[PDB]
Amino acid sequence: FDNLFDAAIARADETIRGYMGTSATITSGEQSGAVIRGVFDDPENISYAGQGVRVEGSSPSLFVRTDEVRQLRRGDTLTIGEENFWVDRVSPDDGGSCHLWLGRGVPPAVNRRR
Amino acid sequence: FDNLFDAAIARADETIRGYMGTSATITSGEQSGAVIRGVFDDPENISYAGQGVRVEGSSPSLFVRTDEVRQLRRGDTLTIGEENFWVDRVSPDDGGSCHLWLGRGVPPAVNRRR
Amino acid sequence: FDNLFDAAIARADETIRGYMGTSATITSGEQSGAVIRGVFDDPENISYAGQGVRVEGSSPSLFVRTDEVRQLRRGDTLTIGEENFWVDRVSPDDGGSCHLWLGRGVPPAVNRRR
Amino acid sequence: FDNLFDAAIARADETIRGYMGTSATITSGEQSGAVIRGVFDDPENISYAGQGVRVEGSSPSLFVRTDEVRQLRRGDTLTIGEENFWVDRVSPDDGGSCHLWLGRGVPPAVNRRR
Amino acid sequence: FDNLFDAAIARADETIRGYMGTSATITSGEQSGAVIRGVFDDPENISYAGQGVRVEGSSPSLFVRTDEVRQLRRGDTLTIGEENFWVDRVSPDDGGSCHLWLGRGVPPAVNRRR
Amino acid sequence: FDNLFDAAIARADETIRGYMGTSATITSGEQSGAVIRGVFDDPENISYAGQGVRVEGSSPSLFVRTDEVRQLRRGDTLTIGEENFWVDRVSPDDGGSCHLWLGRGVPPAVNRRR
Amino acid sequence: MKHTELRAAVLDALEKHDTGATFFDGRPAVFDEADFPAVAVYLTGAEYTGEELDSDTWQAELHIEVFLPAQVPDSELDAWMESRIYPVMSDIPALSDLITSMVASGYDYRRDDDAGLWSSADLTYVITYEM
Amino acid sequence: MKHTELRAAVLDALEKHDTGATFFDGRPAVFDEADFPAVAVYLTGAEYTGEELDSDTWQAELHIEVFLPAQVPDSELDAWMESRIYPVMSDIPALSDLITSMVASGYDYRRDDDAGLWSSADLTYVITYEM
Amino acid sequence: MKHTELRAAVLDALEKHDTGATFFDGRPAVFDEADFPAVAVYLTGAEYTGEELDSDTWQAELHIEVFLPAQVPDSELDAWMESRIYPVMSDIPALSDLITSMVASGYDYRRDDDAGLWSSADLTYVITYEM
Amino acid sequence: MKHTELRAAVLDALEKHDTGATFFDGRPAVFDEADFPAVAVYLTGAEYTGEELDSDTWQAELHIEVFLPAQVPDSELDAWMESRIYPVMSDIPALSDLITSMVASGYDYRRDDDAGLWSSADLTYVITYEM
Amino acid sequence: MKHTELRAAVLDALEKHDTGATFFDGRPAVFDEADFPAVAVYLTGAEYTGEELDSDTWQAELHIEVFLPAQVPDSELDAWMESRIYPVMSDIPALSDLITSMVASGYDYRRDDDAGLWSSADLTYVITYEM
Amino acid sequence: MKHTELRAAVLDALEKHDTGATFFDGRPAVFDEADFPAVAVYLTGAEYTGEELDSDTWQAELHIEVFLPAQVPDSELDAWMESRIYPVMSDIPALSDLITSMVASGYDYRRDDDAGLWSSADLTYVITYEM
């Protein structure tokens, strides 16, 4: 590691993930069968669509080490416990770990014409 | 439990509910006769509807364990002490416990055409 | 009481009212001759009605136990020290005590046609 | 005093005014020649009048016991050190002391037709 | 000094200026050749003027004792280290010291027609 | 140094850079072959351009001593680790160190007509 | 003419039909969840039309607003406006003396999403009288 | 006539074709990710036309709004709007009894960027009936 | 002409009737809950009409506005405008010398909900004079 | 007609020329810095024209919008709009079957200053077709 | 012609009468409590008229704005505006050389309630000149 | 035709006169206090005129904006806008080839009060060309 601080924070993040981690398995993607640990967070948000239409839901996310997620790409599908999630956006590398913003549906159809 | 922290927080929430929680009974719904403990919070709010209109009310809530509320669904009626409440929105599973946003009226008529 | 915490907080509020309380007498209303203690707070606000109009005043309130204010209703008149006040809004039951939002004028004329 | 707290706060306020006090003398008003102590504060504020105009000034205030300014009224003139001030607004009775919002000019002409 | 606090804060301010202050010399004005100490702070700010027009600059300031800048006026010129600054606005007397808001350009031409 | 505090803060910043620093090499510019240490921070930001268009990226920056960055100018190219960056804006001198706001692209074409 | 008379004349004939709802006369109206079906009548936006040379003429807008708890289905609100309030408001013998002309204007719905405490819907009229 | 039967008729004629969607009658409609393809029908902005001397005429706008998950492709909404809603809406035998005139108006797409939980698209109609 | 004279004339003709209210001349008016009714008179929005070739003509709006505490019923404000402010302003001998034409405009109500300390109601006039 | 076909035709006729840029179909377009040249095609604001008695007519606006990084010189953006996009869109054989009339409208630039991550430029067209 | 000599002429003709107030030439004017009256003069909103074929014509608005302390009585601002500024601005021999047409426009009052440090009132003119 | 050509043609003849100012071509322009008097030229709001049957016509607005430090006197900006820019911009021999019609529009001043770092003043033209 470049500095003392980088190694220290790597060990600290590893301990955090060990003590507060949930096992998640990727299903469809380049890492077809990897198993990854992370901290699972499911906060709440509600937005209104008009006069009365209220849409109630949640925005889950996952906190994983960036070394085992290098091959991961947007649109992949992974499972935690019983329910299934897909990867929405992968946060930039902070320290030694990065977030996996997730969605609870099936992946959307793609628009790109490549 | 997946982690040490999950078990620790489950025990902590159980102690919180034991030391600061009242008793509520469901009346109409899938859990017809269950009795559940929870922490009752009744903050107040007022919203105006014009120049000289002021609607005074409050938005109560209940804090319950998520395992014994699995069969609960929106629109059910439950009582605390003397007054009667219905269930508005059931918050996502946070840690080991979830909130029951309540209303003080009679349940409203349904719109769905199933 | 339902819990240990309710009794503890009731005693705490009683000590607060004992050590920082002002005696108030209700005059007109269902509780025609009660004498009530509470904490008196008189903060100030100013609002403008135009370019060169400033209306300067204060919005007082009273912190009282909810058991002896059960029969009190909006529009009643009570006095503290020398000045005279009337009840504007009675806050919902919080713990063991509720607020009495007051106004310094004579009561307004009623609009209801009952 | 009504409570222990009222007397305690009165003594604390008297100590504050003794240790951080400036002598001010009223000149024109019902209290024609009183001498009063208080804490003098002169913060800054600047406001813009359009594209480039920038009026720079300050909003002084004084912190006085409420029993000496009972006869004081808006528009009176008082002096602190060398410069002269007039009374703009007298804050309501908080605890045992009130504020004297001041202005640095001569008093304005009156509008009322009494 | 009127109070104990004024003397104490004056001594504390003098210590602050001694331990963290640079030296600035006035050049043109009523105090043509005075040398004054103060604390030099140079924060940044950027403001835009439309699509992409970004103006990068900073708003420097100085912190001096109010007794040695009595004759100072707006439009004066003073130097710190190597660069040259002019006085923009002289803050009101706070406690025992006042700020000197500075600009880094040549003084602007005056508009007054006296 | 002018004061005790300037020397103290210079040593503090030097220790900070030593313990949490990454080596960066300038490539194109007046300092063609310098090697520079600094602290690297890469936070995220997402902005939307319309109904669904979402642009996700990061805005990196580098914390560097100001004495060895005197000759560096906007538009120069420097590399950290493997990726390549260019200087966008150089923060004003704060204490003894300044920031280097970077961008991850190839430098843009110039507009000036000198 | 005297707005008090007009509001009283509307409310008297609006009360005879059994509705079991609290009626507020004038703009200031304060209530809570208990006495909730509440109908308030007020006049707003008076103006000097100056239509005729013979005598003064004014225009004012008459409002009948009903408040219902939030999340009530739209069907209930439709009913108050189209079954209870429209037939009574068409013909009032008392108004015939005071009002030279009374023209309907459309009603509209609004709900509170800030806190979800109330949902109201006001029927609007245009009143032309003499002052 | 009464708004209730009009929405009932349109929902009846809209349900017969298989869509597998939850239909909401009236303005209030609360749901979550489960029943996402919901379709809501409501009337808004009623007004007094004052067109014919014989009897009353009113104008109101009829809305049919469908909700789809955020980040669903645009082309999917196109199909839901045109292929499903437009053909059924042109001719409905039950409507012609109540509605004197029904005119189309353009549909529009709205997405949510504050939280990214929904994306809807509502077809608007203009209705002229008699009350 | 000189706005001082016009406001002085209006206030003189308005004070003779007993009202027991503090009267404020000009826009700057500061008060508290004691001296409450606080009728204030001011002129606003002067403008160059350019109506006649012979001499200058201007247009300005005359305001009479009364302040009353919040939550005071609507009907009581109605009274001030209908039974006190309006009858006096119809015929005032002093105005006829200065003002060539005075035309009424509708009074309007407003209440304060930010803090609930005041509720005013102004009566607007249009003045055409010579300067 | 079906918006899918029209966007498909435009993208087909626009891809043949070498541009080396990612092309997005419809409103949802999510991309990071790596795929920066990005061209998105979508339709917005359809309405019922009601121009001809024989059959239906609609009006919708066609959008072609390109994204380029912030601080790119304005000159470079000028080039995409005036050398790449304009010549190809003038004559496209596939469109002439579906569209009755196509009319140009002015392109316009916009830059992002809140974060400085993107700078787009869209070219607007007006489409009149049959549904 | 050039704006500089126009403002110079107005200020010269405005200074001769004793007023005892500072005068600011041009838009930037920074002052404190001591220099309270202020009396700034500036030009704004220039436009190309294109009224005559022979030569260039322009329109611009000439502002004369005076600053007085907050809570100063309204009547004082009136007296100031009319009595001092209007008579001098009507006829000025120096202006007639440069300005082809000068038209008045109404003055207006504005006060500061954010901080209560200033209250101003500007007289607006419309200038038609040749550049 | 090509906006690059038009901006280059303006700047070439705007540079020959000695001004000692940094000139920015195109919208993106970044600077600081050192290189301050800076003149930027850009084209905005292009639009399809559709004026003539024979060939295409477009309208674009030509901008010449000059930035000067805040609190600079107004009279100085007048000089920059009239004396230096307006005479040179009247007749550009190289311009007449590309532009069919060039019409002046008024300039205007704006200052920055958020932070006081810049004060700009832009001259606006209307350009009609062929594309």
mmCIF file with all atom_site columns, C-alpha atoms in Angstrom, chain J residues 9 23 25 29 31 49 54 89 109 124:
data_model
loop_
_atom_site.group_PDB
_atom_site.id
_atom_site.type_symbol
_atom_site.label_atom_id
_atom_site.label_alt_id
_atom_site.label_comp_id
_atom_site.label_asym_id
_atom_site.label_entity_id
_atom_site.label_seq_id
_atom_site.pdbx_PDB_ins_code
_atom_site.Cartn_x
_atom_site.Cartn_y
_atom_site.Cartn_z
_atom_site.occupancy
_atom_site.B_iso_or_equiv
_atom_site.pdbx_formal_charge
_atom_site.auth_seq_id
_atom_site.auth_comp_id
_atom_site.auth_asym_id
_atom_site.auth_atom_id
_atom_site.pdbx_PDB_model_num
ATOM 1  C CA . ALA J 1 9   ? -35.620 4.700  -39.042 1.00 0.00 ? 9   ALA J CA 1
ATOM 2  C CA . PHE J 1 23  ? -26.618 5.979  -29.725 1.00 0.00 ? 23  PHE J CA 1
ATOM 3  C CA . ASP J 1 25  ? -33.065 5.175  -28.127 1.00 0.00 ? 25  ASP J CA 1
ATOM 4  C CA . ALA J 1 29  ? -30.003 7.318  -21.130 1.00 0.00 ? 29  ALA J CA 1
ATOM 5  C CA . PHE J 1 31  ? -23.818 6.824  -19.108 1.00 0.00 ? 31  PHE J CA 1
ATOM 6  C CA . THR J 1 49  ? -53.879 18.453 -34.599 1.00 0.00 ? 49  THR J CA 1
ATOM 7  C CA . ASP J 1 54  ? -60.716 12.572 -43.612 1.00 0.00 ? 54  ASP J CA 1
ATOM 8  C CA . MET J 1 89  ? -31.556 14.512 -41.613 1.00 0.00 ? 89  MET J CA 1
ATOM 9  C CA . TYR J 1 109 ? -26.823 24.813 -26.579 1.00 0.00 ? 109 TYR J CA 1
ATOM 10 C CA . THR J 1 124 ? -35.565 20.114 -32.695 1.00 0.00 ? 124 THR J CA 1
#
